[PDB]
Symmetry: none
Subunit: 287 residues, 6 copies
């Protein structure tokens, strides 16, 4: 029994210099990423009540924590994400399957929510397209199970994954942390020549997935020259999203009504063209 009308939440985040109609934002490339794999999208607002979030949590079928440049510890984004994290652990523990996806900053947030500490160190990874150095553990993984063999090989040898991050967790700090090591299976790593860091992971016992790299950009973002756009880069971004959305298809929540559904969808919002200057072609701004 699957849910073939999956709806996924994407978290908004605190805007660097806030003002009316501009307190938070979501980059359109995260919306496109999900929609391409057959999901509809609900922008989740920052600084809302806990009851509001459980309302939303019980209505949607998955959440994605996107990249960005906002505090892991005291932002609207980090508060909301923590609430979604806890709701997800609990729902899943009780057999209500509910997938959570962490991209870049969202990955880092995940290390914090699960470990309870900040374990990040600096990496020369601000603007570089990389292959993935798979671990031996990818062989049984959930994330990469449905990927074509051909694409798996390309991903190992081709610069298909975009990194635009200043911070990482070294495999050493990740392995040194007991909460992380017990919880997450590491599927690939990368290095900048000195630092070896965790690049893709999935929880052992929860449908929680995270990449330090930004899978959504290969199809959808064109304004920086270290975004890969080869044919295999384009498939990589489809197949990642496809896996996440097929995880969302195992969740059976729905909105209380079609009217509540319609009022929540990203379709009520129009994005701004921000590509002349930003890394983002288009961004959604919220009050």
């Amino acid at each position: 029994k699957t849910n073939e009308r999956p709806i996924i939440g994407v978290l908004a985040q605190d805007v660097f210099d806030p003002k009316p109609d501009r307190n938070s934002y979501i980059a359109a490339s995260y919306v496109k990423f999900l929609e391409s794999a057959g999901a509809r999208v609900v922008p989740v607002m920052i600084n809302k009540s806990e009851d509001e979030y459980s309302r939303l949590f019980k209505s949607i079928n998955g959440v994605l924590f996107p990249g960005g440049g906002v505090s892991l510890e005291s932002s609207g984004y980090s508060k909301a994400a923590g609430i979604f994290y806890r709701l997800a652990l609990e729902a899943n523990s009780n057999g209500d399957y509910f997938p959570v996806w962490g991209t870049c900053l969202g990955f880092e947030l995940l290390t914090l929510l699960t470990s309870g500490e900040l374990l990040l160190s600096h990496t020369n990874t601000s603007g570089i397209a990389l292959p993935l150095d798979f671990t031996e553990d990818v062989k049984g993984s959930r994330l990469f199970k449905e990927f074509p063999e051909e694409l798996m090989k390309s991903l190992a040898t081709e610069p298909l994954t975009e990194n635009s991050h200043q911070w990482s967790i070294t495999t050493e700090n990740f392995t040194a942390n007991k909460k992380l090591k017990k919880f997450y299976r590491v599927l690939s790593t990368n290095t900048d020549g000195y630092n070896k860091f965790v690049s893709t992971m999935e929880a052992y016992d929860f449908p929680i997935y995270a990449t330090q790299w930004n899978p959504e950009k290969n199809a959808f973002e064109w304004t920086r020259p270290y975004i890969p756009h080869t044919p295999s880069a384009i498939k990589t971004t489809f197949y990642m999203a496809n896996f996440f959305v097929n995880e969302a298809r195992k969740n059976l929540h729905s909105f209380a009504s079609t009217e509540e559904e319609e009022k929540a969808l990203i379709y009520n919002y129009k994005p701004e063209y921000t590509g002349i200057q930003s890394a983002f072609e288009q961004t959604y701004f919220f009050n």
Copy 2:
């Protein structure tokens, strides 16, 4: 030499009861279909001069003729499509590889442009999801070369292609037309209970591709119970777009500068939420 920054024009369509700010329109699902396979999009306006189109034609890498309800003979859309078709035949003839995709109405328009005739008849195909009945000719077709085998199989046996057309060409009428029989390889057909009609085709000697059905819909439109949304339906929509955008990568046109691109991209425009009413969740309206 390929072009990994492909930009593809999608034709706008004359609005039923046209007002200022609202003379033509593109359903957003066509924009999303292209972007998801790694192209950028430029809307092609109606009622423009032959001069303006050839200049546009010289900057983009491909064109799509979308579905719609507009006239095949006397509309702004059909006048614009004939020009792009004649420009694309000529350019391909001069070693300038330029692909054309026609969906539903676009497919019909293509029967008219290459045969010179209206050969359409009524079919019982306004709102059903269908498999494809592949012709023996698919086995070394271009369009399906890269589709996974398991996906080609699902598509032969599962209701994965959405049909919302009043009109079609029957195989019979197709085969009795010398120009069409000589110009297009037919890759699949369909039935409605009684009529047998052409559902997919590719030109033998030109990169011209056409579906009577609407592959953009599966991942992107949610307003009608006859739109398939299974996992293979989603992949179908990706591999169709993926094929077409790889075709546009063989094209070496470009805009003259990045500021010209910026002036032209679909990013300059915001769509309206049209899904409560119409069959399109979102639509771009133009002056």
Copy 3:
């Protein structure tokens, strides 16, 4: 020993926006269908005591449950046809030959009455003309015993049967019911491009006949373009009714008195001209 003055009942049906004098209706075409094969017709009314219906049943020589847009469980129509159905099961196994005919809705009613269950799925069959795809079982059948060979051939290949229905029982859902499989010989099947459903059937052990299609429209309704009116289409309507009426000539009931007969007959009523804005040229409305 036949009855050469057969009178057949036709069921009225709950109207949508009910007034006085306008609470139930019958489409004139069902009356004409029957008259043309040599029956007189009695309108069976909607909200009556089981005793009224048993009085009426003992008087007339057959019943027809006509197509419509009314519930298969909550309507006056469903209530009445339930009763007639069970009366007829009784009379027949007592050796009192009584025939029943279900058209479209009536056909759908019959699957529910005899199975206990609602086993109907959606079909793309609202407004098409189709041949019949005869099962092998027609060769030994009763319904089609007297059709001329030439009409059987036309019916197999040409669009002679009008389909205007959203629901059908597929051949799968029919075969999996043990109750339906025991009771009814399947005479033809049809398709809609993807689903295969039961279009004509007769009871193995009872004079019970049913068509998902609407034979009465060919000769008598002119208001929709998917009504077939070729000459073989006209003959189809005649031969279908001829059969049913010849079955009613085996039934020996009569009205207790000939003025009570006169009071019951369709002649007392006047149809309205409804063809400007309905599928039906003329409709009888009842209080």
Copy 4:
């Protein structure tokens, strides 16, 4: 090229006791006779200019002169019939195929219109059902070409044709007339035991067909014990009407608009139940 929406006119007739709202009538059996073979019917009114008839003639696809008891020389019915006969003779000669059918009185009128004289004598054929004494000339005939053999065998041996006429033309009297010997071929005769009369005939060169008996009654009138009602009687009346409407399908006339077509149909009129008193179950009365 055929016309599959045939409209046929049925001539009204002067009422015997001529109140307003009741100046002319048509027996409802003639309407049923024709609709049952797939034609719509127009009532052609009694007291009208040669101009309004020409317009009607020019819109409609055939005519029927019914039986009745009105006068052949002085009634409106006789004037109107006379004008349509001449209108139709003319149209036929220009290759505008236009069929005329005569029943009983209508038949008798046709002897008067095409010979110029009155040759009716008295026959004892008020109220008897007769078989048909077919001439050697049936073998070459249009009328019965499409009749099944077994039905031709039944009609020659079984009392399948209803006779309700005081008057006939004897065969002796038919032959001796130069104008009718040349114009009409005689398909059957009958005898009352000493007067041998023409019962069926068709024009050698024109679509004019005529019966002394009443085909329409078998299926549709129930008020007299000499109306045959056997299964073969029912079919005799369908095959007679079938033949005539197919002739009407050769005519391409049309109404000028569809609101004018819509307004001229018998569906605008409601009949009265005249069964308890008269030979006609239902009769249409006009102003």
Copy 5:
């Protein structure tokens, strides 16, 4: 245990000639009436799904069906109120106390909902101020228990209740219906000079209350000469709303979150000044 922040729903109703942003309305006098007695108000929209109306039902603490001139059977308003009526009966039977109030039109709706019949007749009551003719059963009675004695007397003898209704139920037709008689206790009656009608009632077993007169007009509407405005008419509108808001204090529903609560309050809407014309000083219009 009571709820001291009671939120009450007021049903909107279909506008007489609908336009965008003007499909339904609520007169602000209904909102003011409830607010004055210490409740907040939720406008309940007119053409919404059934899951929507339960979501709202489970959120608010009572409903009011207001006056108006809309259909009692086919309107948006009537469909909504039917659903809210059935929800409220069910919650009360399950121990969830939930009050319903019907004014004028809404009183008329209640007789229909509980009897299943339209039992109303004309009375000369479009615009008069009236005393109330109390029945002997006011003496028990919930509705009037907290009213000051001096006010009960004023209400018995002074023109304090405004009547603006074409329709009423006579006491004779009320007593004759078995459902009404059993379910509603009649508290007051009135007469136009030839019909005695029920003017105030309350259910024996449910918190359902209804007035054929309009309590809310005395303090808040100033447009009409028959609206009473004396001190003791001002108190009447307060004591009526006060009893009804105290009934809503026995219900313990709440919105899922403050943010949903804020979204549903009447505070989000601005009413138009309509009093130069309409009978209402101000009116809220909704899309």
Copy 6:
């Protein structure tokens, strides 16, 4: 001779950060407070000439000085209220009954307008609900004369009056001021545990009434946990306004034309939803 259509003025107040459209405000709970006792309200604008105020004053039937945070000495509010206060003493002295109500800030202003001095001290009364500690002098009083005795008992023991003020006149500072002691009767007092202050007063010889607490809030403001909302709290709001509108009913002013009265009324203005931020659910802004 009373005025049964009383219209009451309400002072707007200098906005703390004045933008255009937004120079002054009135909290909507003051408008709702008066309407509920059966008055219509005129907002009295802030920066107007003394002649304009005379014109308004001669037209209306009373004025309220509401709460606020605006200077007592140099604001528009203080100026206009000065002017209204002087007009009112004149008018009441020349036999023309004209009442004044001062709430909170308006009360504080009254202590200054009659003493000539600022006599306020700081009190710990920023957000609490208090009973009234009644003085011996209530038994005479005008204000409480129609209060149900039961309500008077609740107001003495039950936390029914919301205080939200930093300042108060101690009863010692009141007593010691000769102008205040002579001009006002003190109906109630309160303490914050240290300071004992005047909470309700009325003029001996004038219809000036004032409360240090906010009666309007109980029914109409839902933003703060120290606003009381018990049933007796709700009645307290009503009785207080009831008394003040009955005083305005003794005043026979009226506007010069209806066109002028209609242009003055608060219905011309729409409030904004300010409940999320502000302590006021709704507020009216003027330019």
